[PDB]
Amino acid sequence: LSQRSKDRLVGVHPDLVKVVHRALELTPVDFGITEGVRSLETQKKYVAEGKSKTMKSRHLHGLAVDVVAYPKDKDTWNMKYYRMIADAFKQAGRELGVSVEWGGWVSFKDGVHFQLPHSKYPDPK
């Protein structure tokens, strides 16, 4: 049973929180949560620093988490370890009846990234 540290799911949408907790239960590789909610200021920097594309991002409204694998051999950035987690997120999505999206040959940045879909969980107007 993988136990979670002090992780800021606080303000993350409860549908996604519950998917998180369950994916952990059923994960081959232990993981943590790097970012949950991202401030509009932090977001602004990221656009200008040429990181993120639009001024829009799931992270603003608690509709995204990014994870980091803790895979024993310490091999933190191994593509596969993120797919083992995607699989665990998808399945917790199948239970719980939540449609979860994975970033997904998958770049690190895409592979750490989970969100609740736009249709079901839309941005404020």
- Residue 110: left (phi > 0), alpha (psi -120 to 50), or beta? alpha
Report the run of H or E that residue 68 belongs to, with start and end: strand 64-69
Q: Which of helix, strand or coil describes residue 34? A: strand
54 phi and psi angles, rounded to 5 deg: -85, 170
Name which of 36, 44, 40 is nearest 16 in CA terms: 36
Residue with tokens 């656009």: 47
User: Order of strands across the sheet with 101-102?
Assistant: 31-35, 64-69, 113-115, 101-102
Residue ranges per structural domain of the chain: 14-115
Tell me the C-alpha distance between 55 and 66, whole Å.
Answer: 18
Tell me the C-alpha distance between 80 and 116, whole Å.
Answer: 22
Count of helix runs (H) and strand runs (E) in the chain: 4, 4
Tell me the C-alpha distance between 29 and 62, whole Å.
Answer: 24
Name which of 107, 29, 17, 24 is nearest 65 in CA terms: 17
Token pair of 110, please?
């895409």
The experimental method is X-ray
Which CATH architecture group holds 14-115?
A: 2-Layer Sandwich (3.30)
> Residues for the chain: how many in total?
125
Structure resolution, Å: 2.5
